[PDB]
Amino acid sequence: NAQITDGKQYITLDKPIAGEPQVLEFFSFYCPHCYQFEEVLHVSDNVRQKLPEGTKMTKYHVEFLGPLGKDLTQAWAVAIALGVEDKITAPMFEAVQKTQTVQSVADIRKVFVDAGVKGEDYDAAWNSFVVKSLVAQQEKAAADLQLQGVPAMYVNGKYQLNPQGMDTSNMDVFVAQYADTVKQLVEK
């Protein structure tokens, strides 16, 4: 059956925020731990797979890491606005961290284009009011929730996941524990 505990597998915010997405992840394409999180452990997908139906997995990008943090945050806004997150996430992590072929803003676009995204759509999205507000929203969320680092996950703007208090002696275990903790938090 299982049961989680405040202070252990999660922590409760002293200043919860209303109106946030139910399951909100922060990440950076630059961060090695975010790479492991997303591309090796596939934490988020495991979480999403245990999520009570009707509940969506939301991910925001952060600007405070790396030389292109701001522009990658805007590119992620485009990915959201175009609905191409699933086509882009793996290529970008590889291009940024592994092949290290993302050195400029133009190189970001190439990842989208190479991934199947029409350049005309990318360009339209990039300069849209829509994307401009998505950027603002990503920035605002991290501030409101008092983000200290990535990766990070918050549930109902009230609980923060705390992997340090999980069992990290085995990764298959840890992932299952992370997924279940989120599930329990959303049913709460």
Author numbering: 0 to 187
Authors' text:
Structural superposition of these six independent copies yielded a root mean square deviation (RMSD) < 0.45 Å for 176 Cα atoms between residues Gly6 - Val181. The cysteine residues (Cys30 and Cys33) are present in the reduced state in the crystal structure. The side chain variations do not influence the surface accessibility of the hydrophobic groove, which was calculated to be 371 ± 32 Å2 by CastP across the 6 molecules. Moreover, the hydrophobic nature of the groove is unaffected by the side chain conformational variability as indicated by the proportion of carbon atoms lining this groove (69 ± 3 %). The overall conformation of the NMR structure of oxidized KpDsbA is similar to that of the crystal structure of reduced KpDsbA. For example, superposition of molecule A in the crystal structure of reduced KpDsbA with the first structure in the NMR ensemble of oxidized KpDsbA, yields an RMSD of 1.09 Å over 169 Cα atoms. As expected, the redox properties, surface characteristics and binding properties of KpDsbA are similar to those of EcDsbA suggesting that inhibitors developed against EcDsbA are likely to also be effective against other members of this DsbA subclass.
Typically, the oxidative folding machinery includes a soluble thioredoxin-fold protein, DsbA, and an integral membrane protein partner, DsbB. The disulfide form of DsbA is highly oxidizing and donates its disulfide bond to unfolded substrate proteins, leaving DsbA in the inactive reduced form. The inner membrane protein DsbB, in concert with its cofactor ubiquinone, interacts with reduced DsbA to oxidize the active site cysteines and convert DsbA to its functionally competent disulfide form. We determined the high resolution crystal structure of reduced KpDsbA and the NMR solution structure of oxidized KpDsbA, and we measured the redox properties of this enzyme.
